[PDB]
Design a protein around this ligand. Structure first.
Ligand code: HEM
Ligand SMILES: c1ccc2[nH]cnc2c1
Length: 290
């Protein structure tokens, strides 16, 4: 119903966005201490998903386009607790590059994090345009963690995602950790390297249903790993489980499927002129010798 047309920031081209990529990537390298030396990679990915995950396919409300996370209603969404750190991270980036829209910056931060953490290339398109504060979606559009596969499946229909896209997207839970103070879930062992480990862990660990100090159930393993009830639902549902096994046994296929679904997620709600530039594929720092 609402239409949002991609409008390229004036006169900008690939090299401009590569420059923004690189500033994000260098800071990512710089600020290595954050969250017990996990770095900001994971929270930037989470931020990019939460700013896109407000989308509603039925009326094209929410979505990354409007960059509405900058307004207090959305930034104070309880579902977004902890994400202020990612916002604070990108603040000097925005100040150095004031011409990039908020939506483009938030989504590009997510792409950059994934690639720098050795995940797949994620094609990325520019052209999100900031929209006014009253276009900010209401709280409560992001998913709950204490639910089952049916919830997860239904939830993601609203973002136009199918079983394979959901299971692939969840693979980002290889990254970073939960924070009791943020979500009511107790962090387990944490990584900042993007791999298909989330699926391996699901299938190979000895999971026990435990209560954490916030009185929420989560699945914990002797090895110090953890899963959310919605994570675990991927192996409880037989359709989800088949895909989990696939990604666990095929790193390349996971990367390819993640790349597509993550780009899709970041682009939901946006109309790209026939006219628009092709998606950009940014080189990593290591590819550039930086
Ligand atoms: C049913 C879906 C999902 C639910 C219930 C869920 C729930 C959560 C929870 C509770 C947190 C911890 C927040 C805090 O304690 O710091 C979180 C962390 C995170 N989520 Fe999800 N999530 C879902 C899907 C996704 C998807 C689609 C992505 C991205 C493609 C993703 C990326 C992340 C990342 C990277 C973290 C780690 C953040 C950090 O370490 O600071 N999540 N998830
Ligand atoms: C968020 C972050 C890390 C995770 N590891 C397993 N499930 C997770 C959710």
């Amino acid at each position: 119903t609402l239409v949002h047309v991609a409008s390229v920031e004036k006169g900008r081209s690939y090299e401009d966005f590569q420059k923004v990529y690189n500033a994000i990537a260098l800071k990512l390298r710089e600020d290595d201490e954050y969250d017990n030396y996990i770095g900001y990679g994971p929270v930037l990915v989470r931020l990019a998903w939460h700013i896109s995950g407000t989308w509603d396919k039925h009326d094209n409300t929410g979505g990354s386009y409007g960059g509405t996370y900058r307004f207090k209603k959305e930034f104070n969404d309880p579902s977004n607790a902890g994400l202020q750190n990612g916002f604070k991270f990108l603040e000097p980036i925005h100040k150095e590059f004031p011409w990039i829209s908020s939506g483009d910056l938030f989504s590009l931060g997510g792409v950059t994090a994934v690639q720098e953490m050795q995940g797949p290339k994620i094609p990325w398109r520019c052209g999100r345009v900031d929209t006014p504060e009253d276009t900010t979606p209401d709280n409560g559009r992001l998913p709950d963690a204490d639910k089952d596969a049916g919830y997860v499946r239904t939830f993601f229909q609203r973002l136009n995602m199918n079983d394979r896209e959901v299971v692939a997207l969840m693979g980002a839970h290889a990254l970073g950790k939960t924070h009791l103070k943020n979500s009511g879930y107790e962090g387990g062992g944490a990584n900042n390297v993007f791999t298909n480990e989330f699926y391996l862990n699901l299938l190979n660990e000895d999971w026990k249903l435990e209560k954490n100090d916030a009185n929420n159930e989560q699945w914990d393993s002797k090895s110090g790993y953890m899963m959310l009830p919605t994570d675990y639902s991927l192996i409880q549902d037989p359709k989800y489980l088949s895909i989990v096994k696939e990604y666990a046994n095929d790193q390349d296929k996971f990367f390819k499927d993640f790349s597509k679904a993550f780009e899709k997620l970041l682009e939901n709600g946006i109309t790209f002129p026939k006219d628009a530039p092709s998606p950009f594929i940014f080189k990593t720092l290591e590819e550039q010798g930086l």
